[PDB]
Design a protein around this ligand. Sequence first.
Ligand code: NI
Lengths: 38, 39, 36, 137, 137, 137
Amino acid sequence: SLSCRKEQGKFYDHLLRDCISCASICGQHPKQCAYFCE
Amino acid sequence: CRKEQGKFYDHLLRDCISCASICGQHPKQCAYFCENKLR
Amino acid sequence: CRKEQGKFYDHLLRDCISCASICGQHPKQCAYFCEN
Amino acid sequence: KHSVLHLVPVNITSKADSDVTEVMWQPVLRRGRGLEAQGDIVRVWDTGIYLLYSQVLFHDVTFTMGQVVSREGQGRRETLFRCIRSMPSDPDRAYNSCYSAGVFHLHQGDIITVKIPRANAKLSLSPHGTFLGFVKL
Amino acid sequence: KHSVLHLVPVNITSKADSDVTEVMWQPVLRRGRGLEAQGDIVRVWDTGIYLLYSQVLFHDVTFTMGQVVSREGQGRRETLFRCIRSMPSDPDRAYNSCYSAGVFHLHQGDIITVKIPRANAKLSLSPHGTFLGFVKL
Amino acid sequence: KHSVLHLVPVNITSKADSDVTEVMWQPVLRRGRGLEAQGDIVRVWDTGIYLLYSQVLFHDVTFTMGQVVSREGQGRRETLFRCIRSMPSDPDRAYNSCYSAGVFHLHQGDIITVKIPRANAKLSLSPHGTFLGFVKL
Ligand code: NI
């Protein structure tokens, strides 16, 4: 099964309907990615 | 929103914009600043 | 719009586009130009 | 005569620990009686086919911004349309409106929601930047 | 029947000492009466509720582009809607269409304007890229 | 009393030696007479004035993406509208929806096409991301 936990640098984006890597968007990240990106 | 600080009021955006952010993609309001910023 | 000058006619834009300007974000018309 | 409802923002809400921002709506044009704004949602009182349109104006450097328009009724949720805009990383460039619309069957008792799936989304509350409307066909 | 007017460009104008560009419109579809294009504006003859839609196709590297649609009447100016798009820096990439629409109460004597708040804006005269339309509801 | 048709993707097609991608459409809402989806095109059976709207959601780094909506009949092709969106070069950011619409006179026997003028376009099949609709006015 698939895992998308913000604590491991990933979140399910409910606008895009997909799991997104926080590392790929740091600096333009949403609140889900605050822990990982900061 | 002083033109002396390199800022202009954008009537599309309804917001104050800094010329220094946008030289090369600037409207006519920023022409003087973008021409003379390193003079 | 000369294909031999590295240009294609873009049917979305209705304009002649130079392949060199867009390599890396090029459509299939520019494949050969941009890959070679 | 076609029922119409055009709504503009009066406020914004984003609950703590959520990843959602919503707009509180106020009517500025109304004819007929089959829809009613109730804060951040719109209530459907008359079953029928409606043209729904939605614009949000974003001033936000978040990689993508946009809105999701859904209907909730009879224990179910259905997404009607989404609008998505990629945003630049520079704040002075990071302005984009996001418009979408379509025609949909809505049932009496349904709730229509317009959600921005980011916490504390930076959107304009200007009535000519951000708005929501309905025409019963 | 519902009155309709679909307009496309003939030419664009920008006054020397201004920061605005406007479009001179021509009609390509008309049913019924109540509206008339006169140069860069549209006159409202019949009071009513209208769907109003506007698209402009820009080919311009200016950081943001877009249009402002307004109603002028009874000695007042009111913005109905704005559309805004961020543009890329490279001319071969800097193409974007900007669409918006809404439903509005328009009064007899009103003047509708579509203005791009940049001097010498670079926009397409193509009838399928840039257009303005009205449907009376 | 208005006929409507709202269509969503079932599949995308793009022939090898072509520079075009089209969508095979399926109706999710139909009322009244006048129109018929036939795979990648829509057939007009009743002459009249129609509102036409189209959205496509792209996840594609191609420099510009968008769609061209056209009518074909009486030995002539006429482009009705197009939608154009600049895309970022970073695939992680390269999401954009493109919406456009207008009101057009369509004739009995006409074919309506929606084409993305790039081969192998990367577009969403999601029914709330990509859709096509008609309202007879
Ligand atoms: Ni009617």
